[PDB]
Design a protein around this ligand. Structure first.
Ligand SMILES: [Mg+2]
Ligand SMILES: [Mg+2]
Ligand SMILES: [Mg+2]
Ligand SMILES: [Mg+2]
Ligand SMILES: [Mg+2]
Ligand SMILES: [Mg+2]
Ligand SMILES: [Mg+2]
Ligand SMILES: [Mg+2]
Ligand SMILES: [Mg+2]
Ligand SMILES: [Mg+2]
Ligand SMILES: [Mg+2]
Ligand SMILES: [Mg+2]
Ligand SMILES: [Mg+2]
Ligand SMILES: [Mg+2]
Lengths: 104, 134, 72, 174, 176
RNA sequence: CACCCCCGUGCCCAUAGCACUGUGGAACCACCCCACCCCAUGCCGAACUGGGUCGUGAAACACAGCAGCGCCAAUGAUACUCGGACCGCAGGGUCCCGGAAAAGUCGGUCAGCGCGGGGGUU
RNA sequence: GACCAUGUCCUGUAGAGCACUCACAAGGCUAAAACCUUAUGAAACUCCGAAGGGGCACGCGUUUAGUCCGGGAGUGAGGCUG
């Protein structure tokens, strides 16, 4: 089964560290990748791909990361924890991290 | 009556019965009045005598069973070393716990069967007929 | 036989409603009979000691789901 | 009839068969009974019928005895449970079994054992429930067992037990 | 290659006409073909077992894997952690080829009353196949491979119905 | 929190789960779609994974009905017991006061609260 | 300090139960393990589970002990009852 995600999301015990976590959903390339402060039941920085276009999924993903980096920097955030989903750090998601911390 | 394999030893205590206060299976039955151990052999004598009264019968459930070893110390020995090895098995029998339960035999026949089956026993007992049973 | 082994005086060393210094030991255990909530960290033999000074509080839905937090 | 004894009042040495609650969704009721006069009715009705009670206040209430709590040390009753009857097939009652006549195995064979002296069923009629269940054992051979599946269930009754369960069974001698 | 896909596309309407699905995806398909050698009937040294992996690999254009013995010390020369029989999954082009190797000209046809007598019963996919012997190739020369192990070959297919198993052989080039 | 609905992520932590089942469709999600290469299978693009439309709501998933199952669960009555005070040679047991289960019945439920977004009534 | 009261937390005994382990009672079912109706015991069994009991905090209440530091000791064979 997909015991990848409960495992990786129990390994964010370091939400006790105070950093926010950055969920990603390499599914339909919907890769919405929310930023969450877990303590409240609250999310703070959405970046859904509704009509961003940008072409092939591996590069639209980096576009989603570079746009969300601004979308969260507006509110005043910089500590980061990359709560990957079940997905590997394989590239199409790795571009999201590269472009996200390229412009925190 | 003997238990085919176990762990080796035990202990003891008593308080009133919580398993088998009501009769099933049979027509009539018999119930303890006194807390006690009962040996394998006291059972087997009740079986021998109630099978004497029940020739070609087959209505003899034995809703009790020697679970507990009890181990006397050997001949003449001063204390020191374990509880020797088990000398006989016994069944705890707290009051209100049924022992016996017949069917298929008329009231005075079962009543005599229970007279003899109790007289070999080390306890008071009482015959009961079933009706306040859920 | 006639053998036996030393007592290991294990337990809930600090009961909920007890202020604790940092590094106080609060539960001793063979394993994770307690699973350490926020502020607490669990050692090698799975004793869990508070990190932060404050009150001790028991999160406890039970069945292996009992946790010890500390509130400042 | 019964009187109210809410909470924990003392009982008469006339047993007053106390500790009795009747209940459904609606209301819970008081304990006090009339000792042997209870038993004189209960054996006649014996879970398979209802009878009204009249505490001061409520002049009538039908219940069918759900369960009894007898003493263990002295085979006497103590507490009895009850359930009210909302009518219109709501009743889940344990009918006594009974056996008729000589069986072919009672001719030349041996034992005639009722493996289930009572058995539970729903009753389409609420105020009409069988008081017994006479079973036609005449036609079985030695070593056969009447299963519950062919047990007569008058007037559309359902069977609340396994179709394949044995109820009565002839048994070899010895 | 193209012929196996054509038989797939001819089966799918054949099943929609013998039993209408709302969807072509609802139609039974064939997921994977597995072949399980079991040289625990003839546990050997590395020589013979690697030779059998060699012959399955030559037959397949795949590298067979060794299944390894479970913790189960037993009367029957059983051990702890040792090889006890090859296994080979096939999906994609490597799978259909074998079935087109078997439905058509590459069938050994060494023995055949009809197809193996039906075994899925419940009718969901799993159609197990037994080859009593491998005297069924031009890939071997019998005097050198005088040993003749058998083979198991399980077909896995979707099928929510029992009778639908009939589809996976009748229209799939297999005798029934 | 205008009304629904979808994708996700929390609190909760079987009264939320199972099964039977019906609705769902390019909006969302999902399989199918191809593979020399990113990347990978101790054999297989099944799994990760990279390149996408058709097709299809089949399967999975979401959402409703559902009391066959599980899950919870009184009142009442006991068991037991803190203190008090007793009987039996003994096993053992009783009384006064107060606390008081477990099992079972009665009955309860196929949940309940957030947060961000996506598309709807245009 | 001490008793007593409130609040809180921790416990696996009595009891009670078979849900796992050992045992075990009558049958049905059957290549008998398994399975079902019914029926039971368990120091090394537990789906459960009090009364009590221990730590903390308060004193929302009556009391007078406690703590440490320095001198001197003796005691380290216990007996009964419940
Ligand atoms: Mg004791
Ligand atoms: Mg019982
Ligand atoms: Mg010894
Ligand atoms: Mg009560
Ligand atoms: Mg008191
Ligand atoms: Mg006392
Ligand atoms: Mg009391
Ligand atoms: Mg004080
Ligand atoms: Mg006990
Ligand atoms: Mg103690
Ligand atoms: Mg103060
Ligand atoms: Mg001194
Ligand atoms: Mg001494
Ligand atoms: Mg002493």
């Amino acid at each position: 089964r997909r015991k990848l995600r409960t495992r990786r999301k129990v390994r964010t015990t370091t939400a006790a560290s105070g950093r926010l976590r950055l969920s990603v959903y390499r599914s339909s390339k919907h890769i919405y990748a929310q930023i969450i402060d877990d303590s409240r039941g609250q999310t703070l920085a959405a970046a859904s791909s509704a009509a961003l276009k940008s072409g092939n999924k591996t590069d639209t993903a980096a576009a989603v990361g570079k746009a969300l980096a601004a979308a969260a920097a507006e509110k005043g955030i910089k500590q980061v924890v990359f709560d990957r989903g079940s997905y590997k750090y394989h590239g199409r998601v790795k571009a999201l991290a590269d472009a996200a911390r390229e412009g925190g | 009556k003997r238990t085919k394999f176990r762990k080796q030893f035990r202990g003891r205590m008593t308080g009133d019965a919580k398993g088998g206060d009501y009769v099933a299976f049979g027509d009539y039955g018999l119930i303890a009045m006194e807390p006690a151990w009962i040996k394998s052999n006291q059972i087997e004598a009740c079986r021998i005598v109630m099978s004497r009264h029940f020739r070609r019968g087959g209505k003899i459930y034995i809703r009790i069973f020697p679970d507990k070893p009890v181990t006397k110390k050997p001949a003449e020995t001063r204390m020191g070393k374990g509880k020797g090895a088990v000398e006989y098995w016994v069944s705890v029998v707290k009051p209100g716990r049924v022992m016996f339960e017949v069917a298929g035999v008329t009231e005075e026949q079962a009543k005599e069967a229970f007279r003899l089956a109790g007289h070999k026993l080390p306890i008071q007992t009482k015959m009961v007929k079933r009706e306040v049973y859920d | 036989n006639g053998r036996d082994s030393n007592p290991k005086y294990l337990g809930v060393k600090k009961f909920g409603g007890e202020v604790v210094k940092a590094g106080n030991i609060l539960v001793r255990q063979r394993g994770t009979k307690f699973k350490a909530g926020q502020g607490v960290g669990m050692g090698r033999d799975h004793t869990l000691f508070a990190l932060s000074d404050g009150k001790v509080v028991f999160i406890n839905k039970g069945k292996g789901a009992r946790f010890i937090s500390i509130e400042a | 009839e019964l009187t109210a004894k809410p909470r924990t009042p003392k009982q008469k040495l006339d047993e007053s068969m106390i500790a009795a609650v009747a209940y459904n969704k609606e209301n819970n009721v008081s304990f006090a009974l009339d000792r042997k006069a209870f038993d004189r009715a209960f054996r006649q009705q014996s879970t398979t019928g209802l009878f009204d009670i009249t505490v001061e206040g409520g002049e009538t209430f039908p219940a069918l005895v759900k369960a009894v709590q007898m003493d263990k040390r002295k085979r006497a009753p103590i507490h009895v449970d009850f359930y009210m009857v909302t009518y219109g097939e709501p009743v889940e009652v344990s009918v006594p079994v009974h056996t008729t006549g000589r069986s072919q195995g009672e001719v030349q064979g041996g034992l005639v054992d009722i493996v289930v002296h009572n058995l539970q069923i729903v009753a389409p009629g609420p105020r009409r429930i069988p008081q017994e269940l006479v079973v036609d054992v005449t036609k079985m051979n030695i070593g056969d067992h009447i299963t519950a599946g062919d047990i007569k269930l008058p007037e559309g009754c359902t069977l609340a037990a396994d179709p394949e369960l044995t109820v009565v069974s002839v048994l070899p001698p010895r | 290659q193209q012929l196996k896909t054509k038989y797939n596309d001819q089966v799918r309407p054949a099943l929609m006409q013998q039993f209408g699905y709302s969807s072509v995806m609802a139609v039974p398909r064939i997921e994977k073909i597995v072949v399980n050698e079991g040289l625990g009937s003839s546990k050997e040294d590395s020589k013979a077992i690697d030779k059998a992996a060699k012959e399955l690999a030559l037959i397949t254009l795949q590298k067979p894997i060794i299944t390894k013995a479970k913790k189960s010390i037993s009367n029957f020369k059983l051990r702890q952690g040792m090889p006890v029989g090859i296994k080979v999954t096939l999906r994609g082009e490597r799978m259909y080829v074998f079935l087109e190797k078997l439905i058509n000209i590459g069938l050994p046809r060494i023995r055949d009353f009809r197809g193996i007598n039906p075994n899925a019963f419940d009718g969901r996919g799993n159609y197990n196949l037994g080859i009593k012997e491998q005297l069924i190739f031009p890939e071997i020369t019998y005097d050198m491979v005088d040993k003749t192990r058998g083979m198991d070959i399980t077909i896995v297919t979707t099928a929510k119905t029992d009778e639908e198993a009939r589809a996976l052989l009748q229209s799939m080039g297999l005798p029934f």
